[PDB]
Amino acid sequence: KEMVEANLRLVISIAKKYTNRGLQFLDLIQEGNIGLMKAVDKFEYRRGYKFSTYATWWIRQAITRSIADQARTIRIPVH
DNA sequence: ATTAATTTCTTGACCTTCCCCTTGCTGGAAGGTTTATAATGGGAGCTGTCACGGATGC
């Protein structure tokens, strides 16, 4: 909880590059929230990296997944 | 009130597609998973809309 609450600035700073008129801001924010929640258990911090750098890829994956599944009436898949 | 040559009915005997499938790939579509330097308070009207009640605060 404190890990995901200390890094909401990460999702609200990464959600600037995908602010198109397909979805609202809050859906992308809460999809990046579950992407960061997956990155918490996928972190494995013993390599010596920061959480923002590895969490950026997971949150961008969740953002692309939300813009692929949602933001379109005809649901076109992610590929 | 009779039946013998035609004219229909019925029954095997044949004739097509529909669909699944044959070995061997070959390509396309739908769904889920990582990627490991550094990334930490975002973004957008529109008012030049005017005149009523219904609820809030002295």
Report what the structure shows.
The protein is built from 4 helices and no strands. It is mostly helical and 79 residues long. It has one domain: Orthogonal Bundle (Arc Repressor Mutant, subunit A), CATH 1.10.10.10. The longest helix has 19 residues. The protein binds one DNA strand of 58 nucleotides through helix 2 and helix 4. Belongs to the sigma-70 factor family. RpoD/SigA subfamily. It is found in: Cytoplasm. This is RNA polymerase sigma factor RpoD.
Q: How large is the radius of gyration?
A: 13 Å
Helix fraction bin: 55-70%
Can you tell me the overall shape?
A: elongated
Q: What is the name of the CATH superfamily?
A: Winged helix-like DNA-binding domain superfamily/Winged helix DNA-binding domain
Please describe the biggest sheet, giving its number of strands, its sense, and whether it closes into a barrel.
none
Tally of distinct domains: 1
Structural class: mainly alpha
Briefly note the CATH topology name: Arc Repressor Mutant, subunit A
Taking the alpha carbons of the first and last residues, their distance comes to 33 Å
Question: N-to-C SSE series?
Answer: HHHH
Indicate the CATH architecture. Answer: Orthogonal Bundle
Number of helices, counting only DSSP H or I runs of 4 residues or more: 4
Estimate what percentage of residues fall within beta strands.
under 5%
Q: Please provide the count of β strands.
A: 0
- CATH class term: Mainly Alpha
